[PDB]
Amino acid sequence: GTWDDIGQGIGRVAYWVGKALGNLSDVNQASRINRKKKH
């Protein structure tokens, strides 16, 4: 198949997903655009 191999490691998908799931810096940036947009 292939749809199942998508996580096998098509491109650091494992380290990526796990990194994004437990990320934080993402919220930091989005926190600025939020107050900046709504002023």
Side-chain angles (χ1 to χ4, degrees), residues 3-39:
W3 304 308
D4 273 25
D5 235 89
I6 303 302
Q8 221 258 46
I10 307 302
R12 197 131 84 78
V13 292
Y15 233 85
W16 189 296
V17 179
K19 176 152 154 157
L21 290 161
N23 219 283
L24 227 143
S25 322
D26 313 332
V27 189
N28 242 135
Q29 266 93 127
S31 161
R32 171 151 74 170
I33 304 170
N34 248 230
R35 175 247 197 200
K36 183 61 129 171
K37 180 64 72 140
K38 299 142 69 158
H39 180 61

